[model samples]
Target chain A: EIETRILDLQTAVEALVRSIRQLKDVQDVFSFRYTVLRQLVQTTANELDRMRKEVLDISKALVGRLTTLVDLLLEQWLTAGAKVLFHLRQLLKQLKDMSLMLRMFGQGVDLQNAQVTELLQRLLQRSF
Target chain B: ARFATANGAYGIRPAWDSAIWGLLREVEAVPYSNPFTFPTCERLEGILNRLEYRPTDACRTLCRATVAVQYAISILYGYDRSASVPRYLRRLIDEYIDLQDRIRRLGIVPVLGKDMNIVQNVLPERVCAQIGIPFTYEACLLDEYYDCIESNIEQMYDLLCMCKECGMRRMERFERVRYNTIGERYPKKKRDRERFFEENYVIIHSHPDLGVLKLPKIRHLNPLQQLMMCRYLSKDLLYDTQFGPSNAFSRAQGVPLPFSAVQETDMNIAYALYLASNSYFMCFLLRCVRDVLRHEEEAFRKLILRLVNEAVEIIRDDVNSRVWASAEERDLAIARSLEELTFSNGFCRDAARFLDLIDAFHFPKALREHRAREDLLLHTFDGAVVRTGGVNLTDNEIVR
Candidate 1:
């Protein structure tokens, strides 16, 4: 009876060890998967960013050209239509110049420049 | 769970920084204060502190340079006749010019310290104009040719002076609150209470400056100042939130909060200097577009890609185009790269849509519908694009 009991206990211990090893193997596989997913997320985000930049470049060019054509039509082509066209042209010019300037400037300084810096500064500094 | 735990242990809580608390305080009676008239030096100091602790260099530079210029202007205008403009103002101006030159020469600017350069070649010349610096003496001259110069100068000076006052006021509010909080000591408070008080107290303390406290300094004609300040403050706050002591890395490194205090403090001054000198970036894609449009149809069409490529190159060089950096920084840099690209894409879509709509209908037929269509096109552009054949390109490719 004592020998039979000892054999039974030994079998239970071996089974427990096998289970522990299996759990560890599962954890390892999961960790590797997690790392891969993280990498992929990072990669996808970067790809999206690059894609956006290319589009921005294309759009920027188009806007400028359009603005210029509109400006030319207003300034030279449409004399009777010039007033409204001119105002729109002026606004577009402002927007175009400001946006372009701002892009080159980075972080939005042209709003201040056009609104106050260029005109108001000289206005205030004058002898009057 | 790990990130959450770390945040609890180390993150700078945002609610603690909200501006509403100060707004409420402005209405409610203070326990120990007399009725205030003009903002006190201390008040100015506090306001300045809050402004000082803002996140980005753009904000700091704007705040500081404006303040410096205002100081000079106030003295020149006899508002502060007793004291001349501080030498530091001139120094800041010189420094601003230096940075402009550096940006021009180097064609890059480091976002932070020596080791970490985030945004590259940020077109300081362009940035200067946005920060309220005039790009050309000629542009100013055009106005001077017609409008009187003295009035313009006075207006410009006053505007800058007001900006300075705003900066000083913001700083004062921030400092007073910080001093009060750091001074407070309780023997038996729960951890949650301590955290709550710390967050609420700091933000609440600075709130008055941020909102509803009608700035005596900012009142009356200064739309330019208001816009610039708001934009500047927003940038600063965003930068601080993202990169300040509250950032993930800062917390992970177990460094002190306000890790970039000196940088933060000096940034406003730097920006101010940049603003005073009329040296900002002026080149943009529109200029390229204008150039392209001048050429013949075949030439322009072939050069369309070239024009696009140049604009992309400009953006790439201007922002987030560093060759040397780790994968992580590069990844983050790529995100910035997209912002420029996407912005350009929207411009294209607007142009394309405009051309298309104009083609679809006669002038009388298109009037109202064209306006509606134009609005629709504007809204539809969100700057995402997939490249098709002929260009043999993918949108994912960064223009060389």
Candidate 2:
């Protein structure tokens, strides 16, 4: 006697669900790197926050002199630097929402296709 | 997505959809190529009614072929596993339906000339209770209609084979299709435990967001695989491992400053260190992301190098020049440049050190103590082959 492969089919469904999520997460071309960069910046910012006004005070003279040529270099850094950090904060908002909803993991899954979708609907429409 | 018909270059198909698309589009003209007119039974018999107004009699047999195909397409698309169709017939239908979905998601329409080969192979030669098609008028009675359907189906398959031979232009022998899915062939469902577990995958589609209808490759893993993915996919390893409370490097902040990287730390140097340290993790993050993207290693390696180069041109240059200006206004330009150079030098060295660490240009030692279980001289490259004095030729095993 043998059980239906329905056992394995169910397992397969879950696996595809995970792949779907993984693919969706990375499908945003730069989102993956930006998400990590956001974390890196956040950790650094929090640490810098600990040292407080001392460093920004130092950077005032520092950035003041640096700000003279800042137009070019800061322009360079701004165009590129701003580019690097631009979507970083965006992902943090998404990350925050994800945490709030506990959606960082295990959202539900779906299988598609007229036949498969139709079949699952039929399986559920009336109880056994 | 460009049909790659320019100049003498045809590019590559890499998969059946592209191969079939390249073939069929050149052979027969499609009705509308844009949004593939999923032809109605209307496109099938919107012909017969035009008979009186027509030079259409020239296409009467073409009517039967077209009508037969519409039936094929509808029947396949409409099939359900629970349907009352013959068991084997439905099973073959399932395969064509699944493969067609794959091709459709990749943006090729299932035209008959391309799809017929699937039909030809999908239906077995033994001819299970012959199926019915709409073309012939034999009272549409069961066995008689079945016989008519079978004869047309056989002719259709024969015509399919001949068109492929003619229109194929040797494209049919595209032997190295870049099949990104299941190993080679997709087999049927399992009726037993071992076989059942083995054939576990079923097609699952991702519900696309907004306008992106292009589906990427994804599929199910088994029970053991899901357990492994639990720990792996759940966290960013570089971020988690490096900044984790358990990091062994917590003492690094307080660790003595020789500043081999720099002697003394000014706020500028301090900031530089912070930036470099954090940016270093970005390199790690990129490499990790590269793992999942399957991007060429060279691709992200160039990106990592470019960002570091950006820091070099912008941040590093800014630090050096500003400090030299500070030193020039008499706090001591030489001294400021000294600190700048020291920090810059250390930054360069530290960058080199990690680049080496990640590239793993050096491996410690090879040990061959497995069975005998002792650190033996023979395991070391030096000891294993004494020299170009010829247990080896020029013991530069590590080099040319």
Candidate 3:
């Protein structure tokens, strides 16, 4: 009876060792899944951050360009108008000189008339 | 009467007593057929004022139109003389020719009456071709102004020469009086007195000891040339005679003198070399001085080498100083100073030679490598500084 009990004890010890080996295999599978999930979360977070920065940069550039375009358009418009006014004033002066010369030669000219003279003076007085 | 009319139109007040005008009266009177006359000498009296008068666009355009009309009138009157235009005006015309294609692109056509229509249509182009008035209004006006200034300068030079001739005649008279009265009363021989007069005249005019005469002021010369003339007039020694022949050699061979001494010596050498470079007509007087010192060429060479070595040592010291952050910065400082010195003194050619000497010295190995690879003399120190910073240098930086 003592010999049979000792053999039975050795068999139970071998079965325990087999069950511990199977538990270790399950732990390795769970750890690998945990690692893969953590990596995916990290990669998603990084990509979202990059997208947010890109959006901010693009908006800033668009606003700056729009501002520049508006400023340039306004400046060019004013400059062109000023140039036209300047040239018009010069033409009027030249015309006034010609009218005076005509009057000097005793030609019948309406340039010396008060109304016409006043109108010419008014045009000349406008700020270029 | 024509001159009076022209003068009235140009608002010129007659200056009958002025020397330049007096000289003008002597030239053969040419027909005043052209409608536009040259600006009176009075208008070009002040170089500073003339320089300040930068013509506006409208002014320039008006000037070009006026010149075109005048040129047409000249052709009509048969008064177009190619010989009348001075050398400077000829150069101005050439510069204008270079811009012909660009001017043509503007397509400007001046309108005139039916009688003048032939000129009105083609006059602008023809006038530009003949006289080379620039396409741009400002350049055209400036060129006109330059022509006036040049005409005034030429007349002034002529006047000065006439005065010099009068002075020489007076000198001859005095010499004849002394010869007749004194011990050399032999047969009257007509010796060639030209060289004697020229030498004695220059010496008397330049030397402070001869207080009998005053040199004429050439105000039309650029500031650099004026300063050079002043230097020549002052009888300022081109080399430091503090060290006599034996002493100069000893000092030159000695372990380089102080920076101040080196600088003083270098400055004299630079001035001497510059005056010898034939940049100024007044340098003729300086050549006389050099001819007198021809035997001292070896001593001058040694002095130049010593000064160059001293400059190298100075660069080395400055490079080692904490004031300079790097070898490049030190070199840049050296280059800038040299450029300033060269320009301020009109020593462009001499400065180039000095740079060549520096290269031969080879204090910094980098310069040698750059020079060897480039196979061209570094024309300017500023360019060298830029080149050392890995940028290519240009001949434009050489100060012409």
Question: lDDT value for candidate 3?
Answer: 0.29
TM-score of each: 0.16, 0.14, 0.17
Q: lDDT scores for all predictions?
A: 0.28, 0.26, 0.29
**Tens digit per residue, CA lDDT, model 3, B205-270:** 222233422333222233343444444334422222112133332222110111111121222222
- Tell me how far candidate 2 lies from the true structure as C-alpha RMSD in angstroms: 37.6
Residue B282 Cα positional deviation in candidate 1, in Å, after optimal superposition? 34
Per residue, candidate 2 scores C-alpha lDDT tens digits across B172-277 of 2242243324346422332232221123322211111112211111112234533332222233222222222432232122111111122222322222232222
True lDDT of residue B253, candidate 2: 20
Ranking of all predicted structures according to DockQ, beginning with the best and ending with the worst:
2, 1, 3
The sequence of per-residue lDDT tens digits that candidate 1 reaches over residues A30-122 is: 221222214433443344334334433433343343344333332222332233233323433433332331203222223322432333233
Question: What level of docking quality does candidate 3 show?
Answer: incorrect
Report the number of the highest-lDDT candidate.
3
RMSD of each: 35.9, 37.6, 40.9
